[PDB]
Amino acid sequence: IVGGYTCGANTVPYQVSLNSGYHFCGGSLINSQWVVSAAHCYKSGIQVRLGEDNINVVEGNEQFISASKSIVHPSYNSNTLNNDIMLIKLKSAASLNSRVASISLPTSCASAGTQCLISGWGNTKSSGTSYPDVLKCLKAPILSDSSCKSAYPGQITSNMFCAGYLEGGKDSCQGDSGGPVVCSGKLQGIVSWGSGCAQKNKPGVYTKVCNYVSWIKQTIASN
């Protein structure tokens, strides 16, 4: 997260870190046994880490649970990043409390101008590199699809939205991938892609979760 603030330990209780020996992507706990992330975060040997603040220090609230299966969206295209979404089932159900809670799926899509909270442990610089140990947060509005398409000619599909600031300076980044965009108490987006980070006229592009709610509900009902 470039240009954000320190969340505060366990203030974003649905945030997960995906670990394969190290943090490589974020994710969102949507129920006691399922996490949503970006399909571009797929790999084997994922351990889901819940209840994290400092991902390098065991501080007491963590639950480390291995994934039993992962399901990449049937129509995911890695070249265009269309349908960039994936479900991960936990080997055991998490224990849900105040510090570890699920986030609700949307009943409807969010409108341009809606304020959102994006979080993750990704890079905090646009040109340089510096990875935080603790969780970073950013409030950012959903942009109009017109401005989104103007910024990224020929690249924005119906399964994508932009959020952030056209002036730059504030954005998600590498390492934040797969993580939550929560608006109005609902998971509306997944950190997906962008040109660089926090560059002028290049906002963050996010998987449009409201388009996938049926697929998500149907998949977890049979798996």
Ligand SMILES: COC(=O)C[C@H](CCc1ccc(C(=N)N)cc1)c1cccc(C(=N)N)c1
């Ligand atoms: C699918 O992945 C991507 O699009 C990658 C890309 C980051 C590439 C990058 C890597 C390192 C650095 C740096 N060290 N300063 C900067 C940019 C990316 C990933 C997630 C969000 C955003 C976003 N703009 N919201 C951008």
